[PDB]
Amino acid sequence: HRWLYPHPIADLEAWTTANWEWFDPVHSHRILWPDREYRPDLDILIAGCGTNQAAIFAFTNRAAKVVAIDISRPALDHQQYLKDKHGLANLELHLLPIEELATLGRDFDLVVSTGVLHHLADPRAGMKELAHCLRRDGVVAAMLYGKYGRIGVELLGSVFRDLGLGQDDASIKLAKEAISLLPTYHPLRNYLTSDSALVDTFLHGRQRSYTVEECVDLVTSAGLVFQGWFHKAPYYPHDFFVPNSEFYAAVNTLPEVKAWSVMERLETLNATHLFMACRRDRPKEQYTIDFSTVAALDYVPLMRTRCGVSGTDMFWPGWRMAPSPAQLAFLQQVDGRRTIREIAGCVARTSLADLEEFGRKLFQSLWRLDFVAVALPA
Amino acid sequence: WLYPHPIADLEAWTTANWEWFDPVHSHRILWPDREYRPDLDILIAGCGTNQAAIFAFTNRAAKVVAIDISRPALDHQQYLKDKHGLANLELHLLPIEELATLGRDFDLVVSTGVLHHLADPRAGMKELAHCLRRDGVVAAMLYGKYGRIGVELLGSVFRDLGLGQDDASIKLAKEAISLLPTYHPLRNYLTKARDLLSDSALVDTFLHGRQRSYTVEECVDLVTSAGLVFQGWFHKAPYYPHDFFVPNSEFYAAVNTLPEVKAWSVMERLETLNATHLFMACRRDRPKEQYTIDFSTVAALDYVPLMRTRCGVSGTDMFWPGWRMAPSPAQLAFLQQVDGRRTIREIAGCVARTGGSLADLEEFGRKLFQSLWRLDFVAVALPA
Numbered sequence: 171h172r173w174l175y176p177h178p179i180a181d182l183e184a185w186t187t188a189n190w191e192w193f194d195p196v197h198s199h200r201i202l203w204p205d206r207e208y209r210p211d212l213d214i215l216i217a218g219c220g221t222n223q224a225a226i227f228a229f230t231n232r233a234a235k236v237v238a239i240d241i242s243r244p245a246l247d248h249q250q251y252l253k254d255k256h257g258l259a260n261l262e263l264h265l266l267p268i269e270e271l272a273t274l275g276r277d278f279d280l281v282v283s284t285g286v287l288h289h290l291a292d293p294r295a296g297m298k299e300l301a302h303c304l305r306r307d308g309v310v311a312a313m314l315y316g317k318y319g320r321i322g323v324e325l326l327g328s329v330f331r332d333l334g335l336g337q338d339d340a341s342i343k344l345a346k347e348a349i350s351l352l353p354t355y356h357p358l359r360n361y362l363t364s365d366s367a368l369v370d371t372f373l374h375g376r377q378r379s380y381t382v383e384e385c386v387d388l389v390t391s392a393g394l395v396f397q398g399w400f401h402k403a404p405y406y407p408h409d410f411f412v413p414n415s416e417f418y419a420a421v422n423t424l425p426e427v428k429a430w431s432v433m434e435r436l437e438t439l440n441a442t443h444l445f446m447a448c449r450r451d452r453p454k455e456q457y458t459i460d461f462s463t464v465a466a467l468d469y470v471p472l473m474r475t476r477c478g479v480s481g482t483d484m485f486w487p488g489w490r491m492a493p494s495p496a497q498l499a500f501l502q503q504v505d506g507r508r509t510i511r512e513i514a515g516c517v518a519r520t521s522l523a524d525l526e527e528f529g530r531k532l533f534q535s536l537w538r539l540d541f542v543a544v545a546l547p548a
Numbered sequence: 549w550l551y552p553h554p555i556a557d558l559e560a561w562t563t564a565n566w567e568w569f570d571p572v573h574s575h576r577i578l579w580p581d582r583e584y585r586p587d588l589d590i591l592i593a594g595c596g597t598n599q600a601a602i603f604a605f606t607n608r609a610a611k612v613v614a615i616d617i618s619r620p621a622l623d624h625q626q627y628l629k630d631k632h633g634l635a636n637l638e639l640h641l642l643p644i645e646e647l648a649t650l651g652r653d654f655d656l657v658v659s660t661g662v663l664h665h666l667a668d669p670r671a672g673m674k675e676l677a678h679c680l681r682r683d684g685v686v687a688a689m690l691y692g693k694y695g696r697i698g699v700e701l702l703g704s705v706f707r708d709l710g711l712g713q714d715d716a717s718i719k720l721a722k723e724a725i726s727l728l729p730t731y732h733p734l735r736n737y738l739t740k741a742r743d744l745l746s747d748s749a750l751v752d753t754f755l756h757g758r759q760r761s762y763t764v765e766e767c768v769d770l771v772t773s774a775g776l777v778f779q780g781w782f783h784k785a786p787y788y789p790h791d792f793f794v795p796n797s798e799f800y801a802a803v804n805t806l807p808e809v810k811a812w813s814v815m816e817r818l819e820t821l822n823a824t825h826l827f828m829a830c831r832r833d834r835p836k837e838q839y840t841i842d843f844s845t846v847a848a849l850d851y852v853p854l855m856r857t858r859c860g861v862s863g864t865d866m867f868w869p870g871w872r873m874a875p876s877p878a879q880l881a882f883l884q885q886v887d888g889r890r891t892i893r894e895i896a897g898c899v900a901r902t903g904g905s906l907a908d909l910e911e912f913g914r915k916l917f918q919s920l921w922r923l924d925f926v927a928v929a930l931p932a
């Protein structure tokens with residue numbers, strides 16, 4: 171490690187008005203725990219916090235107790251800098267490998283381990299230790315690299331290792347020239363469209379990548395349940411953009427895991443698996459999202475972070491479009507309080523069975539596209 | 549669904565198209581040290597519908613023996629045999645595993661797109677080796693790992709959806725291909741696969757189980773495991789840095805520093821459109837002087853450059869199949885002296901009698917013809 175990765179953040183007041191952490195409960199509480207309001211007083215473990223992550227969580231959740239572990243002293247030294255600068259009294263730092271988490275003698279409501287577990291000798295033993303740190307209703311939020319999104323990186327990485335390249339300036343120069351000489355069609359060009367991030371990606375040894383089924387098997391091997399994805403978009407047919415496709419109908423017939431497995435092989439830009447795991451003894455009503463049954467009509471749709479409606483447009487982060495007038499009518503009634511049944515009711519005052527059906531299908535489609543989350547009954 | 553697509557008429561097909569490993573076209577690549585021989589003994593090991601008939605049609609004085617496990621495939625070779633009077637074509641329903649029953653060896657053994665379909669590809673290559681004369685060549689094609697990513701991705705999806713060879717599966721398969729995002733690895737492959745959406749070729753690629761693909765190192769190991777020498781590539785372009793288009797690249801210099809096989813292995817991972825390994829294998833006891841091409845030695849000055857099929861010079865342009873460009877004036881001067889008779893030394897001599905001493909021009913000639921040999925523009929004739 172020639173430079174610190176990730177790149178150290180100087181000021182969280184600047185960073186947090188512009189950016190956000192995926193698994194920050196301030197933003198993502200309803201995705202982790204669909205059945206409850208934001209809780210400001212969570213016990214949060216950041217397992218492999220690197221330079222910035224734990225300090226961000228402690229800054230945005232001032233009343234939360236944040237415990238952070240890393241094996242890197244320089245990484246923890248930057249968390250300490252951010253701790254001292256911003257008075258993060260709620261942040262506790264340890265030089266500790268994931269393997270020794272039991273030495274903390276604590277369990278947690280949220281365990282975040284993003285971009286860490288592959289660097290372990292035994293990723294399965296790592297996930298087992300995260301599982302043992304989890305309260306009944308707690309969630310492990312994890313990131314692994316995805317096999318089919320990382321093809322380009324693995325190709326160039328392996329070439330750089332066969333040429334004996336390291337982290338020196340001469341190796342970085344050769345590495346950039348190689349990337350500049352890639353033909354237009356090389357798989358790495360799609361991935362590309364930061365000397366520290368270049369070194370971490372290309373010149374820091376092979377980084378294990380995972381299929382959907384390997385992610386699920388890692389989670390179940392640790393005695394945990396695969397709760398689901400942070401971003402659903404990569405893992406489902408986008409039937410909202412392409413309705414009435416017989417091929418997408420045949421994919422939506424398969425059991426969830428086999429269906430995700432198919433879409434990973436058709437949607438190959440996505441290069442990370444962001445997923446949630448929880449305990450077998452967490453009641454399934456807390457987190458089970460199933461738009462196929464009558465219970466879905468009690469789901470309360472809410473706009474996800476940086477999503478919503480502006481006039482006749484619906485927006486995601488960095489993408490806008492005009493839905494059909496009949497679709498917009500449903501989206502205008504999303505307030506984070508009304509149920510799908512209630513929303514169909516409000517549209518009907520502008521059959522009921524047909525509108526409830528259209529509502530259920532629409533919110534299913536937009537949940538799979540990361541436009542709405544759902545609040546489940548308490 | 550016969551694959552490959554049956555050809556109706558070889559008189560029409562052969563004026564427009566050609567087989568890579570047809571000795572009429574490619575004799576100097578298989579045997580650099582000798583002229584075309586019209587009377588070769590040729591084995592087509594897994595001939596499919598067309599290939600053996602084409603070889604027999606273009607080499608009328610050659611004895612062509614063809615084997616396949618598919619009766620319908622051999623039935624089309626027979627149709628072509630009867631239509632064109634290919635008395636020099638002998639057909640057998642015989643697996644490669646039972647080749648020894650024919651009790652014959654051959655000057656040329658062609659096995660293109662066949663060996664992966666075997667239970668034991670290495671036992672297949674061993675049986676081809678056992679039927680090869682001292683100076684004979686095995687011309688083989690295996691699918692390449694990094695060029696076939698797209699095919700393997702969609703193939704595996706179709707198997708997980710339980711799709712077969714029925715009309716309903718072919719319709720779903722075409723719709724799936726239409727729904728692939730622009731960046732899907734299969735899309736670049738589809739741009740160069742002219743005939744792949746035809747029902748026969750679609751089924752063969754996507755709906756008839758996984759076809760094993762190979763890295764450069766797996767091809768070389770398959771050949772050496774059978775007790776053969778890896779002679780080289782039919783097309784060198786995929787396996788070398790294109791220093792003719794990008795001279796003085798420090799990265800390409802570092803790749804050209806590696807041992808040959810590791811260097812080929814690197815270029816396979818940088819040049820990922822190429823989806824087939826077309827290579828030649830020969831016996832360890834074939835004299836190395838017959839086929840060894842090494843532009844780094846003084847012997848290279850005695851190499852006779854020859855234009856490869858559908859390559860040459862018209863005025864100030866040089867052409868490949870499907871690509872034209874203007875070389876530097878000093879490059880053109882060398883290319884205008886390629887006649888398939890003059891050596892690299894002689895060519896430098898002719899340029900010198902028209903920006904360099906003799907030593908400098910011989911050096912420029914050696915480097916230029918090395919660059920263009922690696923780009924499949926010139927073959928070389930070696931001394932007898």
Ligand SMILES: Nc1ncnc2c1ncn2[C@@H]1O[C@H](CSCC[C@H](N)C(=O)O)[C@@H](O)[C@H]1O
Pocket residue numbers: 175176217218219220221222223239240241242245266267268269283284285286289290
């Ligand atoms: N066994 C182990 N236990 C804990 N941390 C580890 C570890 N092996 C590697 N790490 C750390 O894991 C981190 C991965 S980099 C990712 C940092 C942070 N999770 C983020 O999302 O920004 C590095 O800081 C590395 O030092």
Ligand SMILES: Nc1ncnc2c1ncn2[C@@H]1O[C@H](CSCC[C@H](N)C(=O)O)[C@@H](O)[C@H]1O
Pocket residue numbers: 551552593594595596597598599615616617618621642643644645659660661662665666
């Ligand atoms: N064990 C075996 N021995 C001989 N042929 C075999 C075989 N297994 C498969 N084949 C045949 O190999 C062929 C591969 S298709 C390629 C056809 C031809 N070589 C060409 O290049 O156009 C098929 O016809 C298939 O039936």
